[PDB]
Amino acid sequence: HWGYGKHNGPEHWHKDFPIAKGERQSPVDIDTHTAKYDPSLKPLSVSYDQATSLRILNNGHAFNVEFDDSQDKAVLKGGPLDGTYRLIQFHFHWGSLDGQGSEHTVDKKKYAAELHLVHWNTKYGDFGKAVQQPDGLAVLGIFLKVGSAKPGLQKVVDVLDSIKTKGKSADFTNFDPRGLLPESLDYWTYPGSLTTPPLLECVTWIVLKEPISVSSEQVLKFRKLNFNGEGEPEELMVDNWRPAQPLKNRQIKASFK
Numbered sequence: 425h426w427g428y429g430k431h432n433g434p435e436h437w438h439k440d441f442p443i444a445k446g447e448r449q450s451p452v453d454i455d456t457h458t459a460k461y462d463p464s465l466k467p468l469s470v471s472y473d474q475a476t477s478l479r480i481l482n483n484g485h486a487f488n489v490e491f492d493d494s495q496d497k498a499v500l501k502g503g504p505l506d507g508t509y510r511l512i513q514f515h516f517h518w519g520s521l522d523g524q525g526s527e528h529t530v531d532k533k534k535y536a537a538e539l540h541l542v543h544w545n546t547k548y549g550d551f552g553k554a555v556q557q558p559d560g561l562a563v564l565g566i567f568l569k570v571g572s573a574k575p576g577l578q579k580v581v582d583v584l585d586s587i588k589t590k591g592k593s594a595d596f597t598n599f600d601p602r603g604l605l606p607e608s609l610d611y612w613t614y615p616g617s618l619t620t621p622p623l624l625e626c627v628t629w630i631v632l633k634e635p636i637s638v639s640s641e642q643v644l645k646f647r648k649l650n651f652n653g654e655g656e657p658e659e660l661m662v663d664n665w666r667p668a669q670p671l672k673n674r675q676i677k678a679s680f681k
């Protein structure tokens with residue numbers, strides 16, 4: 425029912441999902457001057473060498489690249505986190521135009537897209553239990569700007585023709601998510617929420633400062649996807665981003681000076 429249109433978009437979500445107006449909603453604007461450097465924060469540990477990608481799915485709101493999360497194969501630890509978080513999927517948010525698409529903003533700057541690598545806290549046993557907990561998820565967010573191509577993204581781009589419409593999936597084995605990371609792991613962190621319904625307040629957000637560059641041709645392929653199912657009126661999958669929400673009683677911390 426929910427989506428990104430005039431009639432079912434982010435300004436309507438609160439009617440079915442009242443937590444939409446809650447105290448720890450995401451995304452937010454990152455005001456770089458008021459974020460506090462926190463010397464007690466640790467380097468992030470991204471351990472993706474044994475990652476096992478399985479499948480790519482058009483779910484009607486984005487496409488998800490799904491992983492085997494039945495063992496500790498691709499995990500996030502350190503940084504602001506206690507314990508071990510397993511990678512379950514990644515997906516993107518993007519615009520109809522290069523001047524919009526990201527969910528987080530930086531001093532009100534919107535990027536062309538934003539990658540979310542979604543991980544759940546192994547102490548809760550599965551994703552569905554983790555989303556019911558205030559420290560259940562850790563989401564690594566990475567900005568995309570348009571410039572040079574990202575070679576590690578092209579295998580994703582090239583499979584999108586096979587999953588044009590809602591409900592389509594394709595085999596997507598042997599994909600290495602290390603090829604989507606920038607050089608630096610410097611980050612901001614704050615407590616927040618899922619950015620799609622059910623909007624649960626279960627996320628430790630870790631947003632990298634350094635964007636990756638992708639080509640205009642790469643992002644143009646994202647914008648050829650469809651929100652609709654096969655045989656239905658074509659609606660391009662663009663502008664699948666929630667705008668910045670009120671920060672309320674939260675502090676954004678920086679890992680770097």
Ligand SMILES: [Zn+2]
Nearest residue numbers: 515517540619
């Ligand atoms: Zn997302």
